[PDB]
Design a protein around this ligand. Structure first.
Ligand SMILES: C=C1/C(=C\C=C2/CCC[C@]3(C)[C@@H](C#CC#CC(C)(C)O)CC[C@@H]23)C[C@@H](O)C[C@@H]1O
Ligand SMILES: C=C1/C(=C\C=C2/CCC[C@]3(C)[C@@H](C#CC#CC(C)(C)O)CC[C@@H]23)C[C@@H](O)C[C@@H]1O
Lengths: 10, 239, 239, 10
């Protein structure tokens, strides 16, 4: 997934 | 022999990036689930770690060249080095006096026994402190400490990295600034570089040990349920 | 006309199950992430809700007959009714005086404006309070309140339920005890039963509205990251 | 998944 990481990296 | 514009600019960026993502007063720690002294410290430490990952991400996003890597590699480097960067930056709160991470009052003063109540064993905690001590003894400048973290994060040899060639380049560029800096600005720093690169190796062992211990923890739902979505994501095994 | 052993035994069990899973002093609330007054209350309320789901599970496990259902149906009934049971038990802390859920000091005193800072709108919060008020006005006995929760949880019409026939039976058995009880032990309770079954319907609407609002929230990673693994699991759409 | 729910239900 990595939905959160993706988002945090803008 | 002196630093160049490009090099020095890389230093102003990292040192600014660090200040912007590290509070020496730990004022945000009250927003974490309270610490408690079977894994009573887990909730608080999970919140500490999750909080720190967010900061490491903010820092990473400001390391020169990182923002250009593919979203995948950024994630690969992040997932793989997160725990090491945490251990590095944590030194800034570690105290050789009380052999602990002092972050305020008796509450936010973390001892080994504390991490034991978060699901970790001396197998990990022993070298962690040993590493903290050795790193403290290096009395690093903020420029070298912030450079060591940027260097560690751009390690090309991380499982999952695709464009490992560009990563390898950005890391070298940084490894160069750190070398020049030590020579030019740091006295008696003749053998400091080697000691700093050596530290990166100790981090892999600590990283590996943590990976194992974390894996076990994460497999037990009664425990993983105490973790945070971000921790589960960054340390999780999803591809 | 009076209650039977079996019926009355079902009452001692539910009332005991409730006491064992509901603290009228809310002493555990300090272990939650502190409340803060863009979705500042989300962390604290997520911890409140997650905490409550754990309690609802403990309660469910003690409702007579529930422990016999397949693990799947238990999960289906839990996932689907969790939010409704929470709303029900929450009434016990609701105050008609201040139109809020008073759980201690100014900190744990929850107002609508508070749930608004957790990502919810009046669309939900309006009927919630309206429902809380109407339910409070029923001045229910603990036996009827605990029975209404057991009844709500064994609703056979929940998406995902397999053996919906046995569920339907256990619910009826309970619906019977509640009826007998009201008649025998509750004065002026001639029309109370209908009012209680009516309340179950208002819960479906509140449930539905919450489902929508929660869906939106959960889709935004910057927000879902504030939730807890359990909340993400119980309210999540995984099959 | 429902690993957590499964566990909590013993
Ligand atoms: C995290 C940080 C701090 C101390 C580090 C500690 C003190 C407490 C225990 C820790 C955080 C160790 C751990 C862990 C873990 C874990 C789980 C996720 C449970 O597996 C690594 C570094 C250790 C405090 C401050 O300098 C900021 C830094 O970001
Ligand atoms: C939860 C409980 C309490 C109050 C309920 C509230 C007061 C604060 C806001 C709540 C908990 C409402 C909500 C929500 C939500 C959400 C997310 C997960 C963010 O979508 C429903 C009932 C509302 C307090 C006490 O009686 C125990 C009970 O278990």
């Amino acid at each position: 997934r990595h939905k959160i990481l993706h988002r945090l990296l803008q | 022999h002196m630093l160049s514009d490009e090099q020095m600019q890389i230093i102003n960026s990292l040192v600014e990036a660090h200040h912007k993502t590290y509070d020496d007063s730990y004022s945000d720690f009250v927003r974490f689930r309270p610490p408690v002294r079977r894994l009573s410290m887990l909730p608080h430490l999970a919140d500490l770690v999750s909080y720190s990952i967010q900061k490491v991400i903010g820092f990473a996003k400001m390391i020169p060249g990182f923002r250009d890597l593919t979203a995948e590699d950024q994630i690969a480097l992040l997932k793989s080095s997160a725990i090491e960067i945490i251990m590095l930056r944590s030194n800034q709160s570690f105290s050789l006096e009380d052999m602990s991470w002092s972050c305020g009052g008796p509450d936010f003063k973390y001892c080994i026994n504390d991490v034991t109540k978060a699901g970790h064993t001396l197998e990990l905690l022993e070298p962690l402190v040993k590493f903290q001590v050795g790193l403290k003894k290096l009395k690093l400048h903020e420029e070298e400490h912030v450079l060591l973290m940027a260097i560690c994060l751009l390690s090309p040899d991380r499982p999952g990295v695709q464009d490992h060639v560009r990563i390898e380049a950005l890391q070298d560029r940084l490894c160069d600034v750190l070398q020049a800096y030590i020579r030019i600005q740091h006295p008696g720093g003749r053998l400091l570089y080697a000691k700093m690169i050596q530290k990166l190796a100790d981090l892999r062992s600590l990283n590996e040990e943590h990976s194992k211990q974390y894996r076990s923890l994460s497999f037990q739902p009664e425990h993983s349920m105490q973790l945070t979505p971000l921790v589960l994501e960054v340390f999780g095994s999803e591809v």
